[PDB]
Design a protein around this ligand. Structure first.
Ligand code: FES
Ligand code: FES
Ligand code: CL
Lengths: 368, 368
């Protein structure tokens, strides 16, 4: 029950659980374009956007919220219309302009590079003035312009990646008030993404998990005007960490107290797995699904360390596809596979590590 | 028209065979039997060299007709069996507890990090030496030099066939092939014993439960054979069991079952010829195609969509955990094959998909 640990986990939770309107690809472009703070978008002579291929491929299939359009072009226009103070909720309240879209299309150049996360914007004005913007790395830090920080150090995340599973189990038993509100907002937000049926096999627990997870994932993908609660700057890791648990709870006890603790443990595990991991390819399901299998195991078996280690082991052995196909449906399919692996891991015991910590570290080593 | 019928029929008779135990123990038994020792009690030393990709998948596998698990009883079973039986070497053996204890004192196991390898070296109480070697794939007997029994240009022609060719073949099946398909259905249905992965009752959870149950029956070493496809019993289970379970859950059409099972076997052999493990990537492709034919008939647009979705939702490929890891991979294969029949998007068509999965399995094999 150390109070130093409680403040460290709280700061990391407040830093890694954030709202994002639209998928990372379009939202990141919109935020980077808004950071240039152009007063008159019609006074622009040239706009060059530099994106890495790893991320931003599949941006063509992503709906930009409040535009009724898909891809990079509407995301740039949306950024010119949005406010940088909104961060990844930049598309909120924007009034899409078809006039600005056609104006920008005949002025937009896209440069694609082969590198980790990168989103740079360079803009030439009709008066010679230049404006630059830059968001970099999977932690989405604004490099250009220099902004005031809520300020997690490298040593802080190093301390968190040395914590044990028991530390997260203790934390969920005495959750701060501010974190209870955050978890409840996460549950509400990600449950609101459930709309039309995407993959409904039956009425049982597993199919409700698959159907609700794939439905929330499709709602984001099509460009609906619903924010999502992302975990470690990934809206997919957010859905994967929360929706299989929200659906499991709906199919079982409908216990709001158990749901808060299981969702929180899942987010804590998802951040932990992300911090231990190195990026090169996807990981939404290997990290978010590990949070889900642990969170589901806590809902099902309580504070049982022998059960938790057995679910981590079975999940690591039944790990889904390394590479995601992308496109309009790829992520939804991987997330449905993640549901199956996380759910089925709660019924098989193996003999891939010897415990939760060794399992997360093993999945980290396979990222080569 | 009739040239294709004879080619397909010969390949069907050559690739659909009975197998008693799992490949790991059966391969050891066959390699030990290839030394053809007259008196097993006249042996001074036995060294078995195995690659790790098959050693780890053998430490808990039951050896048929022994009531024991692992490498030691498989070697003893090989000393008792006949090399003319190949993959059915453990058939009819009379296990000797005296020979087991005798051999345990003289047996050395060397483990190497390489593709499939199973070598046996034996020193006689008279100084004479006897060597055996199977490598790359079971039945590839390098030492001793043997005449080629089962049948490169025939497989090359079959590798160039279209999906339509298999759809035509299942509409006018020879009598000898209908008996083979019925024997395959009976044999693999007989492996279903105790429930392994329940999930209640649904078409999907029935497929999962029956597939994982048949796998567990083989894994524990029961003296009941399996119908293997391109050798490998796991590939036979994956190609047949999900279809047998789907048929039991929806209608009970024996005619549609025969055609769907046959198409699945035809696709499974095709995918194998167009090539590491791949039990689920090849057998599961046969299953999704066979299930799609049961569900939609001779519809090429549906079949193309089923292969595309399966290729995008492709399971693990690299199986860890152990022997239970195979049952988990086959349960994941059930989910991917079943769910692929409800989502439309990869290759673009069946042929491009089989060729694509083949290219990615090579990349996974180059990791180690
Ligand atoms: S990009 Fe991660 S699941 Fe698709
Ligand atoms: S060896 Fe093929 S699924 Fe395990
Ligand atoms: Cl096998």
């Amino acid at each position: 029950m150390d109070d130093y640990k409680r403040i460290l986990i709280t700061k990391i939770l407040k830093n890694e659980v954030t709202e994002a309107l639209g998928c990372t690809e379009v939202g990141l472009i919109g935020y980077a374009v808004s950071l240039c703070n152009i007063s008159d978008p019609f006074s622009i002579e040239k706009i060059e956007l530099t994106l890495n291929n790893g991320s931003f491929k599949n941006a063509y299939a992503v709906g930009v919220p409040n535009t009724k359009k898909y891809g990079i072009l509407p995301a740039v226009v949306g950024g010119l219309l949005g406010d940088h103070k909104n961060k990844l909720l930049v598309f909120n309240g924007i009034k899409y302009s078809q006039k600005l879209e056609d104006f920008i299309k005949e002025r937009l150049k896209i440069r694609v590079i082969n590198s980790p996360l990168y989103c740079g914007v360079k803009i030439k004005d009709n008066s010679g003035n230049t404006f630059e913007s830059l968001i970099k790395d999977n932690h989405l830090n604004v490099v250009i312009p220099k902004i005031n920080n809520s300020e997690i150090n490298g040593s802080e995340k190093e301390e968190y990646k040395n914590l044990e599973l028991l530390d997260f189990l203790e934390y969920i038993d005495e959750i701060p008030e501010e974190i209870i509100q955050l978890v409840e907002k996460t549950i509400y937000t990600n449950n609101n993404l459930i709309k039309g049926d995407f993959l409904n096999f039956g009425n049982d627990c597993l199919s409700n998990m698959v159907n609700k997870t794939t439905s929330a994932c499709n709602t984001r993908m099509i460009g609906e005007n619903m924010p999502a609660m992302s975990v470690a700057k990934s809206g997919n890791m957010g859905i994967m960490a929360t929706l299989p648990i929200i659906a499991y709870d709906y199919s079982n006890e409908q216990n709001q107290e158990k749901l808060i603790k299981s969702i929180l443990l899942s987010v804590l595990v998802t951040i932990y797995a992300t911090y231990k991991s190195s990026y090169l390819m996807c990981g939404c399901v290997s990290k978010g699904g590990m949070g889900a299998v642990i969170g589901l195991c806590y809902y099902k078996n309580g504070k049982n360390i022998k059960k938790l280690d057995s679910a981590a082991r079975t999940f690591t052995a039944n790990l889904p596809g390394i590479i995601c196909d992308g496109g309009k449906v790829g992520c939804a399919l991987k997330l449905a596979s993640g549901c199956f692996a996380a759910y089925s891991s709660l019924f098989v015991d193996i003999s891939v590590g010897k415990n939760f910590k060794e399992c997360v570290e093993n999945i980290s080593e396979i990222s080569k």
